């Protein structure tokens, strides 16, 4: 029984933009959550529907590790029952979410002198995302009566916005890397157990 590939997610060189968040399926392995509790300076570590001390014992059928980058002020939106541009239009947790949300400051990796163009978020969307939905559409957003046909202009907005992370921004505007763990618990045999 080999170790679950948590290092590949937490130690990715580059993270995904929140609108195109990454998901890693984790199965048929053995995970170690105790090391993750004291793995670094995880500013956020909130578990929902399960206890972090109990995580090192329970087994699960499937475990998903979703990862992305957001603003510091937006970290509060990665939680059940939240609203905002992130929870509504980029990454949505269900109300009965069973898992943990892990976030840490990454201003030394994901910011650029002059602003980083590499990280984006969906600013415009007609409706809210369903839980765990992923919308990578880059259609020009129609804000008026007349359709756009890929032409930007008045009432025709490119739907994604860059954060422009700079190393000198305040904490609320700095980049934060987020890892969301989900613990699917089906009637199938469990394949992911702690140690």
């Amino acid at each position: 029984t080999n170790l679950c590939p948590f290092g590949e997610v937490f130690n990715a060189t580059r993270f995904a933009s929140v609108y195109a968040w990454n998901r890693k399926r984790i199965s048929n392995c053995v995970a170690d959550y105790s090391v993750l509790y004291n793995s670094a300076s995880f500013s956020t570590f909130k578990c929902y529907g399960v206890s972090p001390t109990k995580l090192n014992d329970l087994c699960f059928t499937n475990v998903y590790a979703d990862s992305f980058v957001i603003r510091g002020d937006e970290v509060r939106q990665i939680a059940p029952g939240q609203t905002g541009k992130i929870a509504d239009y980029n990454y949505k947790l269900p109300d009965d979410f069973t898992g943990c949300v892990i976030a840490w400051n990454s201003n030394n990796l994901d910011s650029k002198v002059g602003g980083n163009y590499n990280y984006l978020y969906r600013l415009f969307r007609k409706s809210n995302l369903k839980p765990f939905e992923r919308d990578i559409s880059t259609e020009i957003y129609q804000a008026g009566s007349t359709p756009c046909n890929g032409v930007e202009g008045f009432n025709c907005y490119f739907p994604l916005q860059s954060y422009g992370f700079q190393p000198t921004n305040g904490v609320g505007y700095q980049p934060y890397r987020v890892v969301v763990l989900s613990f699917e618990l089906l009637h199938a045999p469990a394949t992911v157990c702690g140690k």
Partner: antibody, heavy 123, light 109 residues
């Protein structure tokens, strides 16, 4: 297939200006940014600046600020670079280079380059 | 203005050798480091971006490593079409992109 076809070699006199073009094809022109990188004879590459095709936003290198101008003709998928008050040390090969685009991040890398335009400044 | 330096300044090698080129930044650039190949008279071509990820169409013998200030480009088995000048480039500063001086690799005899 991405293609960037630059204008021909230019011979300018000291003080004049030169406008180098870069015709793009094989991709959506607006979704990407175009940088200009020059290379003096037997030297390294040097970033002059860049232009965003969608809005026209420009960033120049501080030593060329006020002396270089980059424009984008979205109607013909062509980028332009204009360098004025030419001196002898501006003799170089001038490349246009598109970046990965707005989706992967402007200016993060240059995945495609033009063939180069040689600009010779001499009295 | 971040300064990029490369060592060795020049390199002699044979076909089949393991080539290693070093790039150094005057301050931490995180992972915003790219590698380019350039043959005489032609334009540069992207080899590595994000310090270690490979561009589409680039052979698997090219690899990159590094983060912060010290970066490394490795060609596991050199081929005749790999003799050229290799430049590194930082994208940490979108106000001032800077390149390394370039390391030329020639045929050893």
């Amino acid at each position: 297939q991405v293609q960037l076809v630059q204008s021909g070699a230019e011979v300018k006199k000291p003080g004049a200006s030169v406008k180098v073009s870069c015709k793009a094809s094989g991709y959506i022109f607006i979704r990407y940014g175009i940088s200009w990188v020059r290379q003096a004879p037997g030297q390294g590459l040097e970033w002059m600046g860049w232009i965003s095709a969608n809005n026209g936003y420009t960033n120049y290198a501080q030593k060329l600020q006020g002396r270089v101008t980059m424009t984008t003709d979205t109607s013909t998928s062509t980028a332009y670079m204009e360098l004025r008050s030419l001196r002898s040390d501006d003799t170089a090969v001038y490349y246009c280079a598109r970046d990965g685009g707005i989706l992967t991040g402007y200016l993060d890398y240059f995945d495609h380059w033009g063939q180069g335009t040689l600009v010779t400044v001499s009295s | 203005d971040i300064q990029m330096t490369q060592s060795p300044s020049s390199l002699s090698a044979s076909v089949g050798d393991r080539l290693t080129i070093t790039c150094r930044a005057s301050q931490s650039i995180a992972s915003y480091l790219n590698w380019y190949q350039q043959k005489p008279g032609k334009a540069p071509k992207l080899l590595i971006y994000a310090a270690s990820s490979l561009q589409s169409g680039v052979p698997s013998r090219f690899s990159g490593s590094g983060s912060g200030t010290d970066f490394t480009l490795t060609i596991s088995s050199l081929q005749p079409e790999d003799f050229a000048t290799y430049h590194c480039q930082q994208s940490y500063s979108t106000l001032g992109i800077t390149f390394g001086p370039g390391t030329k690799v020639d045929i050893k005899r």
